[PDB]
Amino acid sequence: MAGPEIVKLKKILREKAVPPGTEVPLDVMRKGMEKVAFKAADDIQVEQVTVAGCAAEWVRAPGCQAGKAILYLHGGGYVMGSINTHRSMVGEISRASQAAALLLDYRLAPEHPFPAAVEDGVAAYRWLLDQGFKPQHLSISGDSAGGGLVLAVLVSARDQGLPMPASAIPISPWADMTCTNDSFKTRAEADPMVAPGGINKMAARYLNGADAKHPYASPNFANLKGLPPLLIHVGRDEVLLDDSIKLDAKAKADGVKSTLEIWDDMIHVWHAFHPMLPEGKQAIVRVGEFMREQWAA
C-alpha cells in the first residue's frame, strides 16, 4: 500500500505538529519555517537579484538550458515562507526541468495584504519578459498559497495584455480563500498537516477585508480562458484536494489544457520532502518532464 517513507513521514509530522486550536504568533511560525527549512543540494548555484522591488534568487541546478526560466512562487499561506524556505525544492525543480528558476521573495501579509503578492508576481513575470526571455521559453510554478498565486498571476497578466508562458504547474494549490470545500472535512483525518482554523487565519490576514471570491485571490472563481497548459499536482491525503479537482474542472470548462494528478497517500506539497520521500523526488521529476514537454511543443 503506502511506502514506508510516507508512513514514517506522516508519523514524524504528527509528532511535531502543534495541537489544534493553539494560536502560534506569526513571527514564531515564520522563524520556525525558516529554522526547519532544508538546505539546498551542494550543486545548486544561486545568485541574488532584485526583481520588481523584491529580493530574489536565480536558482540554477546543473544542466540548465540557456534562454529558459521558471518564475517560482513559494508557499506559506501568503503570510510566511521565503527564498530560504523553498530553495531546496526549487533547486530540484530546476534540476528536473533543466531550467533556472527565479525564486521571488514577494510581499507578505499582514504587512502587505492582497493584492500585493499578485502585483509582485505579475511584475516579476513582466521583468522576465523585459530581460529578454521569450514567453514560449517560460514557465510559472508554485506551491500551496504559491500554487494559487500562479493562477492569479496568469489571470492578471492576461487581463493586462501580457503573453502567456508555455506552461504553469501549481503544486497543492490553495485557489479558494473561502476554505469551504468538502475535503477540509473528508480529508482532514488523513492530513497530518496543520491545521486549520489556522488556514482561515491566513486567509483573513491576506484578504484584510477583501472579497474571498475575488478572482485574483481565489482563481478557482476566475475566468481562466486563454491560460497555458496546466499540470496540477495534489495529494489524495490533503485538505486542499477539492481545490485542485475544482481548478481542473474550471480550466477544462474554460478551454484550458489541464492535467490533474492526484497522488495516492501523498500529503500537502509532498515534493518538499524529496530528501526522504521517493514520491517527492518522483513528483518533482514529473514537474520537470512536463515543463520540458511543453517547451518542446
Shortest spacing between CB 79 and Cl ion, in angstroms: 9
Cα–Cα–Cα angle for 98, 102, 104, rounded to 5 degrees: 150
- The smaller minimum CB distance to Cl ion, of residues 107 and 250, is found at 107
Question: Least separation, in Å, of the C-beta of 4 and Cl ion?
Answer: 39
Return the SS3 of 297: coil
112 belongs to the catalytic site:
no
Strands laid side by side in the 45-51 sheet: 45-51, 54-60, 100-104, 69-73, 138-143, 167-171, 230-235, 258-263
Q: Phi and psi for 292 in degrees, rounded to 5?
A: -65, -40
| Min dist. Cβ of residue 63 to Cl ion (A) | 33
User: Could you confirm whether 238 is annotated as catalytic?
Assistant: yes
- Cβ contact 49:58 at 8 Å: yes
Asked if 64 and 44 count as a contact pair (C-beta separation under 8 A), the reply is no
In contact, 72 and 104? CB cutoff 8 Å: yes
C-alpha cell at 118: 499578485
What does the binding site for Cl ion look like in residue numbers (CB under 5 A)?
107, 109, 112, 116-117
User: Nearest approach, Cβ of 108 to Cl ion (angstroms)?
Assistant: 6
Q: Are 191 and 96 in contact (CB under 8 A)?
A: no
Whose Cβ is closer to Cl ion: residue 73's or residue 284's? 73
- Concerning whether 156 is annotated as a catalytic residue, the answer is no
Nearer of residues 109 and 166 to Cl ion, judged by Cβ: 109
Q: Which of 74, 268, 271, 274 is catalytic?
A: 268
Give the active site residue among 233, 238, 244, 258: 238
**Catalytic residue chosen out of the listed positions 144, 218, 244, 258:** 144
> Which residue lies nearer to Cl ion by CB, 176 or 191?
176
Question: Catalytic site residues?
Answer: 144, 238, 268
